[PDB]
Amino acid sequence: QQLMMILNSASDQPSENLISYFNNCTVNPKESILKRVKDIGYIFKEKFAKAVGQGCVEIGSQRYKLGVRLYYRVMESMLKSEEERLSIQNFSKLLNDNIFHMSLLACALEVVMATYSRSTSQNLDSGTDLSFPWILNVLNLKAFDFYKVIESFIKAEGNLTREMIKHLERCEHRIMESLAWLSDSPLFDLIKQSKLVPKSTSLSLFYKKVYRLAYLRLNTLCERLLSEHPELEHIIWTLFQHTLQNEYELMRDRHLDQIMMCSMYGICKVKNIDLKFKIIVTAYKDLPHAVQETFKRVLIKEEEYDSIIVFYNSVFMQRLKTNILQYASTRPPTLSPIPHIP
Secondary structure, eight states, X not given: OHHHHHHHHSOSSOOXXXXXXXXXXXXXXXXXXXXXXXXXXXXXXXXXXXXXXXXOTHHHHHHHHHHHHHHHHHHHHHHHHHHHHHXXXXXXXXXXXXXHHHHHHHHHHHHHHHHHTTSSTTXXXXXXXXXXXXXXXXXXXXXXXXXXXHHHHHHHOTTOOHHHHHHHHHHHHHHHHTGGGSTTOHHHHHHHHHHHOOOOHHHHHHHHHHHHHHHHHHHHHHHHHOTTOTTHHHHHHHHHHHHHHHOGGGGTTSOHHHHHHHHHHHHHHHXXXXXXXXXXXXXXXXSTTOOTHHHHSEEOSSSOEEOHHHHIIIIIHHHHHHHXXXXXXXXXXXXXXXXXXX
C-alpha cells in the first residue's frame, strides 16, 4: 500500500534533485524526456479507453499519471545508486537513450496496472486483456528491451510489496522462456552478432539467467522421473544448453520448456532408457506455472501447431540427431557447467 500512497501524493514533475542530474548531462535530456512522457500519454490513454469502453476517461489518465510518477521516482533512485557506486554523475548517454526511458516507463506502468488491475473489472467486453504483456504492445516495446530493466527496477524500488516483486519476477521468466524469442526480437540480432565475433556482456548475462531458469526446471523433473539414473541430468543438461546456444533457431516462436522436454526424451532414447513423453508431460504440469498449451500446441512448420511429440520427431530430431548420437559415442561431448541456483 505504501508505494501507492507515495505516488498519489507525489507531483507530476521530476524532483529538483532529479533536475540536477539532467543539468549535469552534456546534452540536457529534460526536453526529450518530458516530450516522450507527453507523447506516450496520448497513446496509453487511447489504448486504455479502447480496451475499457466509453466510460470515465479519468481512470486511465490517473493510471498513466501514477505510472509517470513512479517512473520519475525510480529514475532518480537509479541515478543515486549509480552516483554512489561509480562516483560519477554525468549520465548524459543513459538519460538520452530512448530505449532506456521506454523500458523504465513501461515497467513503472506495469506496476501501477498490476496493483490496480487486480480488480474484477477485468474480463473486458472489449476482449482485450490489460495484463502483461499488454503494456508492451501499447508502448510498442520489444520484450527483450523490457527484460533488461526489471532487475535494476527491483533494486531501485524498496517499497515494492513481496507480491509485486514476485509478479515482476514472473514477467521476467516469461520474457526469458518465450517472449524474448518471438520472431522480430532483437535477441536474434545479438546472437548472430556474437556468432561473427567472440562481444556482448548483456547477451551472456541474459543467457546466464536463461540457464538458471532452464536447469532449475530440468533438475525438478530429473529428481522426480530419473532417480534411478542419476547421471542423466548432466548429459541432458549438456544437450539442452548446447541447443539454446547453437541451435537457437529452434527457440523462435517457441518455448524454453519444449526444448527441455525434447532434450530429456532425446537423451533417454539414445541411452536406451524408458521415459515416454506421457510420463514427461504428466510430471511437467506439476511445475509451478506449467500450462498444457506448451506441450499440446507447439509450432511445427509455418502456421501449423501440433503436440510436442510431433515437434520432437518432425523438427527437433531432423536438427539435433547427429549431436544426440555423440552422447552414446566413443568420444561424447564434454559436459557443460551446471548453473548455480539457491
